[PDB]
Design a protein around this ligand. Structure first.
Ligand code: SAH
Lengths: 22, 38, 235
RNA sequence: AGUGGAGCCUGCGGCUUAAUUUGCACCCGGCCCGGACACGGACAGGAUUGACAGAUUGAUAGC
């Protein structure tokens, strides 16, 4: 008899240095 | 320096130069052969 | 304008030319990176010891590069002055004096690889009446196919002065059984264009109808975007 | 006589760049302005205009 199994049964830089000149 | 501001402390050793020497306006430039199989 | 037009290689390559060759920085630099390209152009496996031929060795700086990579080699040349300054250079490998077009005196199944630097272009022209470049090239290439291991590789660097030299060299190579091709390094360049012969041993329907009616000399509708265009489905 | 070798300069490519303009044009920051028509909102209880002083600003400025 088939069962109702719809879903799967298996579950160094300074302070002011800018980023440019760094 | 053209895009950003560089913040610098004026030291006594800095006594002769221009300010523009201490914010550089350009960035440093940081810059496979066929073998025959038949 | 070119060394080939000087004459036979035993006369253009005298002692004075040898001493100008050995004291020449551009010769050293270019022929060194040509030896590098020559050794990298045959797919001999890495970490595998191999035995090589270095023909047209002249100074042996190509041999010095081969010995730098750990590999051993046999030098063959026609000019005595070149072999004299090569032994004066204290090169590691063994040299031999002999014409390549007459034939290489080695037993078959011997060398894992062959490297020829600026030498095959000298066999394209005849500087003696007994000389014939076609048969000389055939003999030299058959001697390569003999003395090489079947399945080994041979790189053959050249600067062909025209396509006739390439035509004859390739014909004499392909009639000696050699399979391979041409690596033309930097093809469209000029100062780096270097030839390396590498070898080894094994709606339209309506358009047609309207062009028909145009050729036949009658009035035809102008050809537009709507020439062949399905007006509607047909039920 | 050379050039191709070397040093330097320059031209195309390519690479780095915010930009390295192109077959002052480029970049980074700051100003200035910028429809009527229709319909719906606010508007004399107030629409909106002008402004000294100080400040932000790289600087000044009722912009
Ligand atoms: N038919 C021939 N047989 C043998 N050697 C030949 C030859 N024709 C030319 N050669 C050799 O080809 C050489 C050209 S000079 C090559 C020098 C070498 N590539 C180096 O720089 O290390 C000369 O030494 C000349 O003797």
């Amino acid at each position: 008899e088939s069962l109702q199994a719809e879903v799967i049964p298996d579950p160094k830089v300074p302070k002011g240095t800018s980023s440019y000149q760094a | 320096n053209g895009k950003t501001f560089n913040q610098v402390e004026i030291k006594p050793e800095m006594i002769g130069h221009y300010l523009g020497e201490f914010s550089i306006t350009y960035k440093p430039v940081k810059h496979s052969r066929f073998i025959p199989l038949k | 304008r070119r060394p080939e037009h000087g004459g036979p290689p035993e006369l253009f390559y005298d002692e004075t030319e040898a001493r100008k060759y050995v004291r020449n920085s551009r010769m050293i630099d270019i022929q060194t990176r040509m030896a590098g390209r020559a050794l990298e152009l045959l797919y001999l496996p890495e970490n595998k010891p191999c035995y090589l031929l270095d023909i047209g060795c002249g100074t042996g700086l190509s041999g010095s590069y081969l010995s730098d990579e750990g590999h051993y080699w046999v030098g063959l040349d026609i000019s005595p002055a070149m072999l004299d300054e090569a032994v004066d250079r204290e090169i590691e490998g063994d040299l031999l004096l002999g014409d390549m077009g007459q034939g290489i005196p080695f037993k078959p199944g011997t060398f894992d690889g062959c490297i020829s630097i600026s030498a095959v272009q000298w066999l394209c022209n005849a500087n003696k009446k007994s000389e014939n470049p076609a048969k000389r090239l055939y003999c030299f290439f058959a001697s390569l196919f003999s003395v090489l291991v079947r399945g080994s590789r041979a790189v053959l660097q050249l600067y062909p002065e025209n396509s006739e030299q390439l035509e004859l060299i390739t014909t004499q190579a392909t009639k000696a059984g050699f399979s391979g091709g041409m690596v033309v390094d930097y093809p469209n360049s000029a100062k780096a264009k270097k030839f390396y012969l590498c070898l080894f041993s094994g709606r339209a329907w309506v358009l047609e109808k309207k062009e028909r009616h145009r050729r036949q000399g009658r009035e035809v509708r102008p050809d537009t975007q709507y020439t062949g265009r399905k007006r509607k489905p047909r039920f």
